[PDB]
């Protein structure tokens, strides 16, 4: 809960500084925890300055 | 559970003697027992009928030191029994083992008699009982274990029970600390200040 709140605070501050971003929301299931963490880490550098991808 | 804490705010809040100390020195010269406890002590504050009934029930419960659920059980048993539940409740309360040990002079107060009973120092029919709720029947012989007959507590308790009034329903054999329960004490054997009608009124609502 604490990490979620801190991330929300930082993201809200940055977004209000810039403007808005178009999110692509995905629900990701995997077979092993290592694969899940690798996918989550690798699907974070794919966004842009106007579009971004979120794992909900 | 058990109420453990200041055992004299209860007397001030109830406004009666409500014996909880040994009665050795006094009650007035320990707490100025004329004000309700707390900051707002000087206020009088006349209260309502429900308040009077609640105060009466609390006074009885704090006299005999039992909690609410056991007291409700006592009330249900008194209602179930025949003949005027009002004094049936007192008949049943006056037969508990800790109260009987207190009345026999083995303990100074109810808490100390509870201390004695719970710590395996009392035998009822020649065999050990340590439940401070055991309803003693007419004709039992409450005694003290031989390994527990040299405790001073009993000595001071007996010499101080020597002057509080004659119970006249238990015979204590002072030299070897053995008692006898002749019968339950009738309503006329207790103080005529408790208004048990208020208790029955409170629970019948």
């Amino acid at each position: 809960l604490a990490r979620a709140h801190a991330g929300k605070l930082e993201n809200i501050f940055e977004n209000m500084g810039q403007e808005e971003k178009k999110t692509l929301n995905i629900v990701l299931k995997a077979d092993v925890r290592g694969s899940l963490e690798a996918l989550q880490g690798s699907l974070s550098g794919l966004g842009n300055d106007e579009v971004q991808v979120r794992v909900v | 559970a058990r109420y453990i804490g200041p055992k004299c705010k209860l007397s001030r809040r109830e406004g009666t003697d409500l014996f909880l100390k040994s009665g050795a020195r006094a009650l007035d010269s320990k707490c100025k027992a004329e004000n309700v406890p707390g900051q707002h002590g000087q206020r009088r504050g006349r209260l309502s009928d429900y308040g009077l009934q609640l105060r009466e029930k609390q006074k009885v419960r704090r006299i005999y030191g039992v909690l609410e659920r056991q007291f409700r059980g006592y009330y249900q048993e008194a209602s179930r029994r025949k003949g005027s539940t009002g004094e049936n409740l007192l008949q049943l309360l006056e037969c508990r083992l800790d109260n009987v040990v207190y009345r026999m002079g083995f303990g100074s107060t109810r808490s100390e008699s509870r201390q004695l009973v719970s710590h395996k120092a009392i035998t009822v029919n020649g065999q050990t009982v340590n439940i401070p709720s055991y309803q003693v029947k007419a004709g039992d012989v409450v005694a003290v274990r031989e390994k527990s007959k040299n405790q001073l507590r009993i000595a001071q308790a007996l010499e101080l029970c020597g002057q509080r009034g004659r119970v006249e329903w238990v015979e204590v054999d002072l030299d070897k600390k053995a008692g006898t329960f002749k019968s339950a004490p009738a309503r006329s054997d207790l103080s005529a200040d408790i208004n048990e009608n208020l208790i029955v009124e409170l629970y019948s609502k």
């Binding site: - | 003949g83 005027s84 539940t85 009002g86 049936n88 009608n197 029955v200 009124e201 019948s204």
Partner: protein, 154 residues
């Protein structure tokens, strides 16, 4: 008799040019606890004066009630206005099982085992009227024996 119960105290108002005048009304019951009972109403601009007027009014017009040793003769059912009242004798161990004005009336009159109930409007003053109407028309034996001899009727 001297037993005072303050059944009710209330604040009423009337309107004139300028605003409102407040008055205090009190309803009380008086009795000796052994047969006699009366009720009184008193109005003033002060609560103590209204209560004293109610007590003085209630001390008059006392009535005598026939009762079977702190217990009613037979079940009674009495009405006044929209208020209805049921009463019936109870055994010795019972207390007063009644609500509000009825409890004060019955305790003052001297009955101790009444097991009562009220229906309809529960206006305290009308309940008091209904309770005295029930209690006053209570016959008791040796008076119902106006017809014939006694011990054969029962």
């Amino acid at each position: 008799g001297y037993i005072e119960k303050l059944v009710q105290v209330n604040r009423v108002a009337k309107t004139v040019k300028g605003g409102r005048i407040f008055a205090f009304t009190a309803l009380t019951v008086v009795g000796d606890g052994k047969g006699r009972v009366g009720f009184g109403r008193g109005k003033a601009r002060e609560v103590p004066a209204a209560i004293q007027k109610a007590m003085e009014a209630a001390r008059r017009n006392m009535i005598q009630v026939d009762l079977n040793g702190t217990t009613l003769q037979y079940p009674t059912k009495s009405a006044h206005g929209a208020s209805k009242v049921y009463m019936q004798p109870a055994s010795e161990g019972t207390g007063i099982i009644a609500g509000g004005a009825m409890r004060a009336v019955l305790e003052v009159a001297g009955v101790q085992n009444v097991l009562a109930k009220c229906y309809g409007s529960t206006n305290p003053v009308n309940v008091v009227y209904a309770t005295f109407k029930g209690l006053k028309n209570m016959q008791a034996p040796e008076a119902v024996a106006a017809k014939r001899g006694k011990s054969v009727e029962e």
